[PDB]
Amino acid sequence: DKNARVIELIAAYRNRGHLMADIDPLRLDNTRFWDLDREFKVDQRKKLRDILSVLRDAYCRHVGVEYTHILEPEQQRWIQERVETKHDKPTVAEQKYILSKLNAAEAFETFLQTKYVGQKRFSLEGAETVIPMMDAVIDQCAEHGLDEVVIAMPHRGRLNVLANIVGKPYSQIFSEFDVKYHLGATGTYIQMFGDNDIEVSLTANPSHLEAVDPVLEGLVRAKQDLLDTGEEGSDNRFSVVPLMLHGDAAFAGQGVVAETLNLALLRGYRTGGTIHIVVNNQIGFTTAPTDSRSSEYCTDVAKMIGAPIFHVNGDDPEACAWVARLAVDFRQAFKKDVVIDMLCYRRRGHNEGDDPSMTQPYMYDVIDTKRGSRKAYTEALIGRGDISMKEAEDALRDYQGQLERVFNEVRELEKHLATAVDKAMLQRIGDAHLALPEGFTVHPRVRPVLEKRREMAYEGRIDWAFAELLALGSLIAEGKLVRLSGQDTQRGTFTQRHAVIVDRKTGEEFTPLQLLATNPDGTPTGGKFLVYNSALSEFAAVGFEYGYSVGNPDAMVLWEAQFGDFVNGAQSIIDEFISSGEAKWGQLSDVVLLLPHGHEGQGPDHTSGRIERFLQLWAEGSMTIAMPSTPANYFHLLRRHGKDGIQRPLIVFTPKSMLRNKAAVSDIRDFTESKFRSVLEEPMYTDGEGDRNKVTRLLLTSGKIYYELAARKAKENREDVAIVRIEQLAPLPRRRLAETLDRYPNVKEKFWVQEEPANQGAWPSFGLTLPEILPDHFTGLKRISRRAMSAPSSGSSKVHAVEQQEILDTAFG
Amino acid sequence: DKNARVIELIAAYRNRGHLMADIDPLRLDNTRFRSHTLWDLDREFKQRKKLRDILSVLRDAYCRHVGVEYTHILEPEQQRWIQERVETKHDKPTVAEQKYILSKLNAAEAFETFLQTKYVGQKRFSLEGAETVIPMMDAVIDQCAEHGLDEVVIAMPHRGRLNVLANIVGKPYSQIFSEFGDVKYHLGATGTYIQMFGDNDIEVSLTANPSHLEAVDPVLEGLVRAKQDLLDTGEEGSDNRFSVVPLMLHGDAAFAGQGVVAETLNLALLRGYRTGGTIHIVVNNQIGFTTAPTDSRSSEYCTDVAKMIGAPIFHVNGDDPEACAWVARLAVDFRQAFKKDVVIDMLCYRRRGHNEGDDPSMTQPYMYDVIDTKRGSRKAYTEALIGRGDISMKEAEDALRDYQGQLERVFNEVRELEKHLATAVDKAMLQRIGDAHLALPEGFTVHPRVRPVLEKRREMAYEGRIDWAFAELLALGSLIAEGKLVRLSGQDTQRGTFTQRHAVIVDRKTGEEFTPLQLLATNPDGTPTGGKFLVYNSALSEFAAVGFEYGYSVGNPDAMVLWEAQFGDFVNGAQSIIDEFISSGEAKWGQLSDVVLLLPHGHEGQGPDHTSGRIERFLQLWAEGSMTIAMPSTPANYFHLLRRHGKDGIQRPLIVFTPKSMLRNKAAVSDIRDFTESKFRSVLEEPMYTDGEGDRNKVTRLLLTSGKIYYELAARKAKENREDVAIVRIEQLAPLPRRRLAETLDRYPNVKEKFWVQEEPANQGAWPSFGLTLPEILPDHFTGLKRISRRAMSAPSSGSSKVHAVEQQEILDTAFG
Ligand SMILES: Cc1ncc(C[n+]2c([C@@H](O)CCC(=O)O)sc(CCOP(=O)(O)OP(=O)(O)O)c2C)c(N)n1
Ligand SMILES: Cc1ncc(C[n+]2c([C@@H](O)CCC(=O)O)sc(CCOP(=O)(O)OP(=O)(O)O)c2C)c(N)n1
Ligand SMILES: [Ca+2]
Numbered sequence A: 001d002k003n004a005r006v007i008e009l010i011a012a013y014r015n016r017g018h019l020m021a022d023i024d025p026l027r028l029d030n031t032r033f034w035d036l037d038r039e040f041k042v043d044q045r046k047k048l049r050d051i052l053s054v055l056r057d058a059y060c061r062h063v064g065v066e067y068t069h070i071l072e073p074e075q076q077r078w079i080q081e082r083v084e085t086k087h088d089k090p091t092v093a094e095q096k097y098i099l100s101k102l103n104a105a106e107a108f109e110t111f112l113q114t115k116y117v118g119q120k121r122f123s124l125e126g127a128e129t130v131i132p133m134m135d136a137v138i139d140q141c142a143e144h145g146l147d148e149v150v151i152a153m154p155h156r157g158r159l160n161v162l163a164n165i166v167g168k169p170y171s172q173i174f175s176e177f178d179v180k181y182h183l184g185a186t187g188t189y190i191q192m193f194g195d196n197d198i199e200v201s202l203t204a205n206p207s208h209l210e211a212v213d214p215v216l217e218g219l220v221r222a223k224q225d226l227l228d229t230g231e232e233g234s235d236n237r238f239s240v241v242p243l244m245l246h247g248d249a250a251f252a253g254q255g256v257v258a259e260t261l262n263l264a265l266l267r268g269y270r271t272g273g274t275i276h277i278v279v280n281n282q283i284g285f286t287t288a289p290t291d292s293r294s295s296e297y298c299t300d301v302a303k304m305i306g307a308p309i310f311h312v313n314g315d316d317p318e319a320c321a322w323v324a325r326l327a328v329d330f331r332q333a334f335k336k337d338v339v340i341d342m343l344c345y346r347r348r349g350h351n352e353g354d355d356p357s358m359t360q361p362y363m364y365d366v367i368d369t370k371r372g373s374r375k376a377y378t379e380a381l382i383g384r385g386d387i388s389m390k391e392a393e394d395a396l397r398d399y400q401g402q403l404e405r406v407f408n409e410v411r412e413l414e415k416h417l418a419t420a421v422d423k424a425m426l427q428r429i430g431d432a433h434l435a436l437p438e439g440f441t442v443h444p445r446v447r448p449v450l451e452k453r454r455e456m457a458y459e460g461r462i463d464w465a466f467a468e469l470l471a472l473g474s475l476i477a478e479g480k481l482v483r484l485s486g487q488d489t490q491r492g493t494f495t496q497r498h499a500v501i502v503d504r505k506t507g508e509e510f511t512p513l514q515l516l517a518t519n520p521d522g523t524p525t526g527g528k529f530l531v532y533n534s535a536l537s538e539f540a541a542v543g544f545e546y547g548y549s550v551g552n553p554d555a556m557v558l559w560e561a562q563f564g565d566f567v568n569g570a571q572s573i574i575d576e577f578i579s580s581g582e583a584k585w586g587q588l589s590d591v592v593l594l595l596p597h598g599h600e601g602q603g604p605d606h607t608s609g610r611i612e613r614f615l616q617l618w619a620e621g622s623m624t625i626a627m628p629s630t631p632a633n634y635f636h637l638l639r640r641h642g643k644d645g646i647q648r649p650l651i652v653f654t655p656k657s658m659l660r661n662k663a664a665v666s667d668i669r670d671f672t673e674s675k676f677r678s679v680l681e682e683p684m685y686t687d688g689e690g691d692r693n694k695v696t697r698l699l700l701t702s703g704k705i706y707y708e709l710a711a712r713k714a715k716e717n718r719e720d721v722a723i724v725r726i727e728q729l730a731p732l733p734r735r736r737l738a739e740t741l742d743r744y745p746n747v748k749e750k751f752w753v754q755e756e757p758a759n760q761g762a763w764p765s766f767g768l769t770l771p772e773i774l775p776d777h778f779t780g781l782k783r784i785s786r787r788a789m790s791a792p793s794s795g796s797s798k799v800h801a802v803e804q805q806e807i808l809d810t811a812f813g
Numbered sequence B: 001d002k003n004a005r006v007i008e009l010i011a012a013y014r015n016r017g018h019l020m021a022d023i024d025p026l027r028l029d030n031t032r033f034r035s036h037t038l039w040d041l042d043r044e045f046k047q048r049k050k051l052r053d054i055l056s057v058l059r060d061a062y063c064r065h066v067g068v069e070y071t072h073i074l075e076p077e078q079q080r081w082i083q084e085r086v087e088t089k090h091d092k093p094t095v096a097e098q099k100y101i102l103s104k105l106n107a108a109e110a111f112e113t114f115l116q117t118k119y120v121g122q123k124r125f126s127l128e129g130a131e132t133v134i135p136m137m138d139a140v141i142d143q144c145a146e147h148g149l150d151e152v153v154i155a156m157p158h159r160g161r162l163n164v165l166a167n168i169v170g171k172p173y174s175q176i177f178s179e180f181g182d183v184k185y186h187l188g189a190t191g192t193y194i195q196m197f198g199d200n201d202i203e204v205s206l207t208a209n210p211s212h213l214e215a216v217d218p219v220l221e222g223l224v225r226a227k228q229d230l231l232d233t234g235e236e237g238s239d240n241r242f243s244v245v246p247l248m249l250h251g252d253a254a255f256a257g258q259g260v261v262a263e264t265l266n267l268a269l270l271r272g273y274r275t276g277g278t279i280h281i282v283v284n285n286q287i288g289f290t291t292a293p294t295d296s297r298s299s300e301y302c303t304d305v306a307k308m309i310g311a312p313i314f315h316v317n318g319d320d321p322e323a324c325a326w327v328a329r330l331a332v333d334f335r336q337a338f339k340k341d342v343v344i345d346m347l348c349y350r351r352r353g354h355n356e357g358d359d360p361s362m363t364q365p366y367m368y369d370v371i372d373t374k375r376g377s378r379k380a381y382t383e384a385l386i387g388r389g390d391i392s393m394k395e396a397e398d399a400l401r402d403y404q405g406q407l408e409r410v411f412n413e414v415r416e417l418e419k420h421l422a423t424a425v426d427k428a429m430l431q432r433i434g435d436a437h438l439a440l441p442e443g444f445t446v447h448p449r450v451r452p453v454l455e456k457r458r459e460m461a462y463e464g465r466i467d468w469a470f471a472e473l474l475a476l477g478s479l480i481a482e483g484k485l486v487r488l489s490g491q492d493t494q495r496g497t498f499t500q501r502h503a504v505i506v507d508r509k510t511g512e513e514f515t516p517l518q519l520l521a522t523n524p525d526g527t528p529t530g531g532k533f534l535v536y537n538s539a540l541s542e543f544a545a546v547g548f549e550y551g552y553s554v555g556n557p558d559a560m561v562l563w564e565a566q567f568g569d570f571v572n573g574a575q576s577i578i579d580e581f582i583s584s585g586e587a588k589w590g591q592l593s594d595v596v597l598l599l600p601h602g603h604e605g606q607g608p609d610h611t612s613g614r615i616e617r618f619l620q621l622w623a624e625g626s627m628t629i630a631m632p633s634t635p636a637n638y639f640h641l642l643r644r645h646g647k648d649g650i651q652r653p654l655i656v657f658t659p660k661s662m663l664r665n666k667a668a669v670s671d672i673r674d675f676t677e678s679k680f681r682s683v684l685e686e687p688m689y690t691d692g693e694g695d696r697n698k699v700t701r702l703l704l705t706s707g708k709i710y711y712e713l714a715a716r717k718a719k720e721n722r723e724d725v726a727i728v729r730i731e732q733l734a735p736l737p738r739r740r741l742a743e744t745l746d747r748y749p750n751v752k753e754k755f756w757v758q759e760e761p762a763n764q765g766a767w768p769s770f771g772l773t774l775p776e777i778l779p780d781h782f783t784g785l786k787r788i789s790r791r792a793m794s795a796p797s798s799g800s801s802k803v804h805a806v807e808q809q810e811i812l813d814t815a816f817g
């Protein structure tokens, strides 16, 4: 049974060989490491010695291969065939080219640590092989004739990446020389040995490690949709490649990594596979891997989506470049993620004042005996007889010339619009709900919704749900790309949207708004409706949609929270990208966040989108924040946002029970002959027979509580009280608010009325701002709200009801 | 050619057999059992077994109602342990065990019927189509009691929670439906489980949680670890039993989409966070509200994230309660043997719509047409027992009588329910903590850069000029000496981010760790104090780490628990824990926590992600008695703040905005007397008025501030000899120290103008809340209060250190202009 022992041995190398591969350039773990002439049958008859030597070189040399966890047998076979073959040794030209990339990379590092103070944390020393590795990824993408490689990375080696991968000149990199470590960049990569070129860009990011991961994916997907490539394209090339860099401690500890990997094969989020590179320097500031992860590898999270993982020795730039090229080939064949775990080291301390032997003495005693990756490769090429002593001297002169070039170039640098639509547009969107495909079976409970929409489009009484689809549908008809997504967003959390309808017999999906992408003459408008149900993620989903608006500034991008209360799971994206990206990096986004909000007795996690937090984050021109009370005002808000020619995030506090409130409906004329109104008066004063001069008490409010206040006003016939709505919370509509209040000359008292606790809602900012920006109108402004609470509401629906009545009685008391 | 094909086939069943297992009770995928020589079946292969016998063992173990994933496990002993228990002829359960399982399905299903009939608006909580989770959870707990363990702590979302309370926790209906009501779906509970066939009992508890699915996952881990440390079991125990078991329930869409799941799994084998393995149960009803699995995950299984830590995964058919109970018992046995997580993927269905107003055939017509033909799990099991001849017709009839009796009991019981302190230490304490830094173990080699820190600490302890970093260790060390358990953790927290702490020192030659404060756990006479110092470097996580420390403070209310952010700027990665547990858990659930968050804060030119812990956000979250929020300016006041927090006998979170450059500021040092003869000061005056020769009556301009900007304001006042300006510090930001604030400002009668001074932008720091609150709570003192700060910004600061420097000077010039 000698042949049986061979089969088990072959399986052992393929499954576990990576545990014995020489991947660590520091060799920190000591414990880590005759039928030979008899011919055995293999899938071919070869000697056991030749079977074993192919398996040791393939799996136990400088590359640890993990692929037997992949469920697809064709993917396992593809890797097996490319890994278990005698590889063609690289040509002297390729070896010299790798060496030139190592020279440029280390001369950049030497210059950085010598020329400037405070640059130790950014050092790529001990990890310079990432430069020829990233070069091989991009060169291989250009070999496949792809259009672009978009990079996302943390700060380590970023300016080196700018100079030696993006190809930015020193004059631009060191111009007015820390924000440079967070800025976006764009360039063109020209193949050294090939005849192709490819676009290379780097995205902007905060210091929050891994938070840019879903942003990168969103941005790339936006670029893929524009190029008609990938999931929403005519071709299956996915010609825009995400190249995502990571650190070993951050890759294992940050939850956003798993959420972003979870998007990789989703119809709404896939980008045809991401190339991941982990700069595994086997440390996280002062922290050893045993305190940073509970798994053998920092890349083990990527096993979640059956991605192949390649652990590679960073002191072998040839194996690193070969693995990079294999990764691109796998991504092209299976449109799925590949992870490259580059084992390397951090030569110097984490930052100034870090003596790394204080916390890691054993590691740093080994590192202190380490010659650079460039010097090691130069000496290895001599040993193998690949390059002559003269060639190695020319290589050192190239190093010096590159070191001099950067010093000399930086030295010279130091020396020197209506939103209204026509009735026919409303009618076309209405009729689109009944223009079903041949033989389509509508669910019996969905059919009245489609009939009511055709009725509303011709007769009025348009509800919130339809007004939103009227805004999006008219934008699609004008040629705009509309991307809408979130948890159960196709149907709607409150069963109100039905943007996608499902055939009761076949399960086939029909999207009524997609018919507006075609003009009445049959020609395309250039518009699209891309609507998806998201994964149960907030961080990665909000990240993605923010990224998508950056990737396509001409798109209308909306993310919807199930309830506004769950958006705090995406706080890092709100804080680091959405509210602040423009001021910090000049990076613009027109992303829309829809946050269902309102006190209805559903508890502290189904009541508030935390208005007070978005209002606190706001500064002049950073975001638009609104809480519309009418369907038409919401329609005009969305149309203004998509057509204003301005890239600024919009935060909308959307209704729940108010979706079905019969008083919260709009007339055809409000869509065809009106505009967005930042401040709304009661219709009895603007259209009715109400007398503004009789008003002595003015109630200022926003949202659904208006209807309750107006119902109470009508019941008691209170002509002395007027209700004014602030529809646009930020920026404050100072002019409209001044002109509106001036029309009520006999007002003796003013109250800001809100459902939210005293420390929440708009009061903390309005109570401070309104008396300041409008002292003649808001001096003496008082608050009517729920009491200050440590949670957004009471957990009891009975307590909610008493508090709601208490607000209305106080307002009319 | 024959024996080799068998070995490959054995490997194929072990590796991929789970892809062909009959695990889905709905059988939605038709192609599932179609995309996976006859003379060799009778030939024996080398133990020597016939190929037909090898194939029968493989098919029964890997292709029936249990899908086993385990060959991804790197440890070969763990793979062999599973193989041996799965590839054997299992003992058929006794009729008593089968009847006991059936009685748990009767109870589970009678509770579901009652819930949907008695009350309105309970559809969203329906466990219907997933009732087998109750005999499965029962088998987990019973198996933990069989191992003689102390407690099982459960964390779960809302689906089937009250059923779990009644049939697992054993809470009576009188308590469950008392004044029914939605808050009951988020409350903690405790009970005792008594073995049906065994002689042991075990404690069973359920922890509180928000609606935020999976956010409780790290909280559960923290809580269990605190309970294990108290029981001297596990990682910080004399025994390696880990006698407190985390039982974590999940939904299939949430388990795959929430990042906190992966961060919590990442903690499972860490010395500072391990709990000896968690038993995970995913209630995989193959839907997430209206969303199909193909839009919720990019992997074959919702549980594929657990492959990250090489956890064994069992996919089990929820219509086979015998396989479900067997797998639950095997999971407990594996967790006991290897102290690692086990994940049980229970495939089931959601019988009704997601909530009121959901007609599930609108979005999932194919799935709901199949579900509409499904008989309950109880009825299916009752009929299967008849078919196998396990129970008689009379036995199936008494089973149906038991269901009716249980349905009547809950209706009848609910019907009957409706009818009815000094912080000052002695100088010897300071000296002991100082000397402890030099009381090195025999032959210990101190790193040459760490030795001056040890010597300076012995010097400071005896001579004064105590800096912030030593004051913090003086507060923690004195608490340990008094018998308190101190747990301190965060990113690079052993050494400290600013190389200031050195709570753990590393031997330059051997790498061995020495903890100077741990010497204070032993009295000078050699007896233990009862105290302990648990200090760790955390994983590079905020959400799971903050979650863990909050849960740890709940698990042991007598512990001093502190979590440190690398920089306050990264705590927004844990916003869900701050919002849902820390700031609000007491008001929502009556759940108390004394957790401390240390947030390094201060404008120093390091950018918008290395400047602010967002004071304005914690101040906004605050409501009377929910949290204590402070920004101390002196080492002694920080020492007294921590000691008051650990000794006040009150369970309330403390948020501390801690220094960075001010750690090394020579003016920010304290005298021995500040520690030995003082207390925490919520409001601080300039020493020239309290100890010096300054005249308070000369002051016409009063500057109110907090934090390090005080030193810059005081340095400017000294330079220009500004006797007309006084600087008052608000050390305790929340609750506002109204009485101390008023009494302090009354001592400056000639003040004509008052300014709140801060480094933070106008829309940040304490101004948005103080600017609104101070003129209201103290109208005679703060009417006309003006702000001096940075301009309002969309980020916490400028990205440029040059812009920062101009703005910093602009604040100081405005304050003295
Ligand atoms: C989400 C979040 N939370 C924490 C941090 C803090 N933080 C950093 C700075 O910001 C601070 C300190 C410094 O450099 O001065 S660097 C760092 C360690 C990174 O380890 P890694 O992934 O192995 O990488 P490598 O450094 O290439 O070895 C952390 C943990 C962060 N930025 N984002
Ligand atoms: C982190 C976060 N983000 C979103 C939500 C919202 N949300 C829920 C309610 O809260 C809301 C609607 C409802 O029930 O009325 S339930 C739910 C779907 C759950 O799918 P699952 O895991 O497969 O489970 P199952 O329901 O047992 O099948 C979501 C996505 C949340 N709670 N937490
Ligand atoms: Ca816009």
Ligand SMILES: [Ca+2]
Pocket: B594, B644, B645, B646, B647, B648, B649, B650, B651, B652
């Ligand atoms: Ca306390």
Ligand SMILES: [Mg+2]
Pocket: A247, A248, A249, A279, A280, A281, A282, A283, A284, A285
């Ligand atoms: Mg690292």
Ligand SMILES: [Mg+2]
Pocket: B251, B252, B253, B283, B284, B285, B286, B287, B288, B289
């Ligand atoms: Mg589900």
